[PDB]
Amino acid sequence: RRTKLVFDDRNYSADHYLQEAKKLKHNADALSDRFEKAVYYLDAVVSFIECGNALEKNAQESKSPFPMYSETVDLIKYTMKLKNYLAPDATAADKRLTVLCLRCESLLYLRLFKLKKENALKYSKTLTEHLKNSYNNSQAPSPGLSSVTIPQKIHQMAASYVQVTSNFLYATEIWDQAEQLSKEQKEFFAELDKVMGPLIFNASIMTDLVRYTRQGLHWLRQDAK
């Protein structure tokens, strides 16, 4: 009854995946039934992730995927606001689709982190030392028996460090969200894990996520369509 997708083992250009995802996103923009709207939005999201993955591993011309993954995260956030999973009459299809969306969003946040992760150790070093090194403007030292002044570069560095750290903070929270929600469709997702191999937080690559989500979408389609 359940069938596994035989996957296209070509590595097309990022432009090809971008056009594919735009076609799917506009199919979804046109549709009126929110569930099929959301299914096609997740299909487009998978193609967008493929476009970013191609921007990364394009052998003879590599560009940056960070805006791609970020805007795709925003697309997933929009998508989840159509068929709310915590709704009273929320079907099993809505819940499984939400779990797939959450997996995609968590892993995309994690990549967004890892694309700029090199800055954060550097910045943690120097920002820890300088934020023990800021004690001014309100109380002078008080020998015994408010507002704070910090250097400009320290401020910009703290801003960028928070910007980079928010990414895995969201990734961790959304991954735990996905884990928890998967308990209410444990059988569906145990079969999916058995067929595809489970998604690993810090290990699964974008192609693993693409194939896993496409398999889940295939089963969701057959259960409704």
Author numbering: 902 to 1046, 1081 to 1160
Please share excerpts from the published article on this structure.
In this study we identified AFF4, a scaffold protein of the Super Elongation Complex (SEC), as an important transcriptional elongation factor required for ESR1 gene expression. In mammalian cells, the active form of P-TEFb is tightly associated with additional elongation factors ELL1/2/3, EAF1/2, AF9/ENL, as well as AFF4/1 to form the Super Elongation Complex (SEC). Importantly, AFF4, the scaffold subunit of the SEC, is largely responsible for this histone mark recognition activity. AFF4 belongs to the AFF(AF4/FMR2) family which contains four members: AFF1/AF4, AFF2/FMR2, AFF3/LAF4, and AFF4/AF5q31.
To gain a better understanding of the molecular basis by which AFF4 interacts with H3K27ac, we set out to determine the crystal structure of the C-terminal domain of AFF4. However, we did succeed in crystallizing and solving the structure of an AFF4 fragment encompassing residues 900–1163. Surprisingly, the 2.2 Å structure shows an all α-helical homodimeric structure, instead of the predominantly β-sheet YEATS domain-like structure. The ordered portion of the structure, containing residues 902–1160, with the exception of a disordered internal segment from residue 1047 to residue 1080, forms eight α-helices. Helices α5 and α6 are extensively involved in homodimerization. Phe1103, the residue identified to be important for H3K27ac interaction, is located in the middle of α6 and involved in dimerization via stacking with the same residue from another molecule. In consistent with the structural result, AFF4 dimerization was abolished by a rather large deletion of residues 971–1117, but was not affected by the single mutation F1103A in cells. Our structural result contrasts the expectation of a YEATS domain suggested by sequence alignment, and precludes direct participation of Phe1103 in H3K27ac interaction in the present form. 901–1163 domain we crystallized is not competent for H3K27ac binding in our pull-down experiment. Our structural result reveals that the 901–1163 region of AFF4 is a dimerization module, instead of a complete H3K27ac-interacting domain.
